[PDB]
């Protein structure tokens, strides 16, 4: 599993093992990659893609954080002009002055804690690391890396993009967060582990009546004897005058 | 960008063509990934349930 355990908490270890039983991380990554490939095949000719490719992926790749590999390979009939790296929410992107024929897509799943639940920073850092890494081999220098935070249900991509891929990837991520089977199973297991389920007309009479009962208010008189300077002259106001 | 509104639709279906519940889709994915399917008794129970559902939906 790709989860790091800061501090020997056997309780949390058992709980996380129960949640991710039966190689759930690998199944989640597999489901995500198949869903993305299906989406790309359903919109193949619209973006000038010759075909998609299922890269041979080592099982550990799903939970391999030190290095990485390729997940999906896109082959083209025409040249793809590529743009400079931008985030998933970067509406304005600057075009790079180069083209390619084979385009790689990588999927990285993470379990972010409270301090490191920023998916965009993680995606950017890991894209700039794996691309310029020596134990990670990419088919092409140009591609996209999508980081998905299962602990907080986030997703962001920072790699190199070509025109027409932005909306496709956006709705692909939307639909895959909305209706992935493996992600739904993860959510259900987490829920089970957490045991959480879903005038001067009538006012004059009132004033007269209140003043009629104001006699009893004189029987209880309180003096706010606090914050007294105790230097000036004291007040000896009599009780009869105050009652009157 | 090029300019389009890609209709990215992802659905789970089976060899019978019926839409699958997320639990059923996950079960199918796990069975295919583990390399081993369900047992004979489970297969017979599933087939009987499917036949009963088809009979009930026919009226």
């Amino acid at each position: 599993t790709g989860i790091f355990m800061h501090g020997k908490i056997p309780t949390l270890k058992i709980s996380l093992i129960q949640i991710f039983r039966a190689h759930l991380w690998q199944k989640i990554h597999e489901s995500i990659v198949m869903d993305l490939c299906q989406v790309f095949d359903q919109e193949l000719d619209a973006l000038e893609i010759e075909t998609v490719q299922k890269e041979t992926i080592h099982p550990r790749k799903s939970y391999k954080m030190n290095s990485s590999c390729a997940d999906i390979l896109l082959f083209a009939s025409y040249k793809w002009n590529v743009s400079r790296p931008s985030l998933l929410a970067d509406s304005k992107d600057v075009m790079d002055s180069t083209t390619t024929q084979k385009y790689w897509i990588d999927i990285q799943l993470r379990w972010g804690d409270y301090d490191s639940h920023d998916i965009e920073r993680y995606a950017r850092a890991k894209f700039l690391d794996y691309t310029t890494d020596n134990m990670s081999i990419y088919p092409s220098p140009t591609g996209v890396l999508i980081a998905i935070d299962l602990a907080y249900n986030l997703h962001s991509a920072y790699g190199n993009w070509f025109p027409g891929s932005k909306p496709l990837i956006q709705q692909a991520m939307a639909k895959i967060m909305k209706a992935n089977p493996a992600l739904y199973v993860l959510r259900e297991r987490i829920r089970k582990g957490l045991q959480l389920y879903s005038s001067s007309k009538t006012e004059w009479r009132v004033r007269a009546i209140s003043a009629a009962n104001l006699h009893l208010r004189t029987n209880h008189i309180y003096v706010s004897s606090d914050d007294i300077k105790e230097t000036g002259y004291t007040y000896i106001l009599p009780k009869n005058v105050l009652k009157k | 960008k090029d300019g389009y509104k890609p209709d990215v639709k992802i659905e789970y279906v089976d060899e019978t063509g019926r839409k699958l519940t997320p639990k059923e889709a996950f079960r199918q994915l796990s069975h295919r990934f583990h390399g081993k399917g369900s047992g004979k008794m489970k297969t017979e129970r599933r087939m009987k349930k499917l036949d009963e559902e088809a009979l009930l939906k026919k009226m």
Binding site: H23, Q26, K27, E30, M34, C37, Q38, D41, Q53, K54, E55, T56, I57, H58, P59 | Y12, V13, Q28, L29, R32, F33, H34, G35, K36
Partner: peptide, 18 residues
């Protein structure tokens, strides 16, 4: 498509088949 490749009891190379 919707093909789901095998993880357990493959006996071949570690990486997934195409």
């Amino acid at each position: 498509k919707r093909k789901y490749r095998q993880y357990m009891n493959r006996k071949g190379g570690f990486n997934r088949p195409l």
